[model samples]
Target: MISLIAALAVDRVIGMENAMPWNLPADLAWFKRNTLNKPVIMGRHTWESIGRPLPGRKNIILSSQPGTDDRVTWVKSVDEAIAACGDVPEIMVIGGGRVYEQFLPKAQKLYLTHIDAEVEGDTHFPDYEPDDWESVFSEFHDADAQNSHSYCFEILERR
Candidate 1:
């Protein structure tokens, strides 16, 4: 199964420039917990934003300009990324919008953190039909000292 993970603002903004627009430590922790030990794929910019391979998971990157790196597997296209996963039960698409757009249709699950505030951003998460997905999990959290924004963690599975 293909799953996606993102933290989006109320207006669906996911990023600005090459990085995320908000700092929510709790949401980051939530992201880490869910993607840990999974094969997570992303676009080249996402990889650049991260600057290093995530610990304890296979980091697969989509890039037309493939580079030499044993720590991460660089693929030219989405199909190649899928092929690289082989028989894994699930591959997580941890993205920039361009990467998420390609996998949105095929993704069986979405682990999304819906942020409570509107913000400026150049990139957005792709919109999908709400009726096509069933909510499997939903948890709302209030902003605290560590987390700057109130957010909700939602898991949606294709119906």
Candidate 2:
């Protein structure tokens, strides 16, 4: 199954200057634990931002341009990425704006970290109706001594 994982602000902002605007250790930890060893598909920009492949996960970067990196499997399209993930129980669609839009329709599940703040951004999350998906699970986390930001972790399944 294809799944999408991302963290966004209240204004639906996902990135600012190719990086996340805020730091949320809890959310980062959650992402690392869940996506470890999984096949992660992302756009070229997202791959470039990281500057290197994430250890332990299979990194597939989708791009029309040609380039090679031992850590990245470059594909020209989403179909190719999906094919690369063949037989894997789950594939993750990690993103920069365009990639998220391309994979949203094909994703079966979504793991979203919704922050209670907004940031100035040029990129935003794709717009979808509430009826398009069902919230399978959700949990609220408070800003405390350990975590500086308040947010909610939501698991949504395509309807």
Candidate 3:
């Protein structure tokens, strides 16, 4: 199964200058908890955002150029990325806009963090219809001392 994990604003903003616009520890925790140990696919820019492979997961990146490190597999396209995953039970697409858009159609599940406020951004998550998916899990987290905005975590399975 292919799953997409993303934190986007109400207006579907996901990135600003190659970084997240908001800082929400709870959301990051939620993201790690779900994606840990899973084979994660990301675009070149997404890979650069972290600058290293996630400790416990196989990092597969999509880029036209070859990668230098053996720690991560560099694929030239989405098809190659999927092929590189081998027989993983669930392939997690952790992204920066374009990567998500490419994988969204084939994704079986979506782990989304819906930020309450709409902020300015250059990259946005792909638009999709809510009616096409069935919510499997959801939780709301209020803005507090740590997190700047209220957000909701939702897991939706394709119908």
Candidate 4:
């Protein structure tokens, strides 16, 4: 199974100058909690954002031209990345807009953090028809007293 992971605000921008626009500790925790030890797929810019392979998970990068390191597999297509994982029960597609859109249709499950506010951004998540996917679970949280916004952790599956 392929599981997609992302935290996007109402305006749907996922990145700004190679980083997230906000700092939400709990959202990071939720992301790590779900993706730890999984085989993760990312695009070149996404990998560049982290600056390196994540410590616990194997990283697969999608790019037209890039070399592979000991910690990551370089591939041009999602099929190649999925084949690289081969038998894993679930491969996590961590993103940079394009990567998520590429795998969204094929993903069996989605782990989305739906943030409450909208802001300026260069990238945006692709829109999916609501009728095609169904929410399986959801948990909402209020904004922190600090630099955070209200958000909901929602799990959805293709119907």
Q: Best-fitting candidate, measured by TM-score?
A: 1
**Candidate 3 Cα deviation (angstroms), residue 89:** 1.0
72-149 per-residue lDDT for model 1 (tens digits): 998998989999878988899999899999999989999999999788999999988889899999999999998888
As for candidate 3, its clashing pairs are none
Please rank every candidate by lDDT, starting with the best: 3, 1, 2, 4
What is the C-alpha lDDT profile of model 3 across 1-159, one tens digit per residue? Answer: 999999999789999898887889989899899999899999989998888889889999899987878889999998899999999899999998999999999999999999987788999999987888999998998899999899999999999
lDDT of 4 at 114: 91
Taking all chains together, the TM-score of candidate 2 against the true structure is 0.95
Candidate 3 yields a Cα-based lDDT of 0.92
TM-score of every prediction relative to native:
0.96, 0.95, 0.96, 0.94
Model 2 pairs in collision? none
Clashes per model (N, Cα, C within 3 A): 0, 0, 0, 0
lDDT of each: 0.91, 0.89, 0.92, 0.87
Q: Residue 136 error for model 1, in Å?
A: 1.4
Least accurate 10 contiguous residues by lDDT in model 3: 62-71
User: 53-110, model 2: which lDDT tens digit per residue?
Assistant: 8989999999898967866788998899999877899999988789999999988999
Model 2 CA deviation exceeding 4 Å by range? none
TM-score of 4: 0.94
Which ranges of candidate 4 are over 4 A from the true structure?
none
